Amino acid sequence: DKNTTYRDLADKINEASGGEIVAKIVNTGEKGTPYRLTLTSKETGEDSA
């Protein structure tokens, strides 16, 4: 929805991913836009995808 905050959506997507895909918020030391999104998956190479 257009009025919702990241905070609320963060809980929602954990359900949407089922926790099978792991995501968290990380910074670049970047003032003004300190949020960056990381998405992670596992296998012996890029094929984690």
């Binding site: 990380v26 910074n27 670049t28 030391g29 960056r36 990381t38």
Partner: protein, 50 residues
């Protein structure tokens, strides 16, 4: 004369597991959760919790 400047001060810099972060020194605790860390050289490394 800048030659008198034997050495200049600069930071240590690191990633938060992928995304980079520059700080004055080789010690970090901004992770929260209860986690503490110290740096000893410029490299890549993996650590584990049990």
């Amino acid at each position: 004369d800048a030659s008198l400047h034997i050495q200049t001060a600069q930071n240590a810099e690191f990633t938060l597991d992928g995304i980079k972060m520059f700080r004055s020194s080789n010690t970090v605790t901004d992770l929260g959760v209860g986690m503490t860390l110290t740096l000893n050289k410029t490299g890549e490394i993996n650590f584990d919790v049990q």
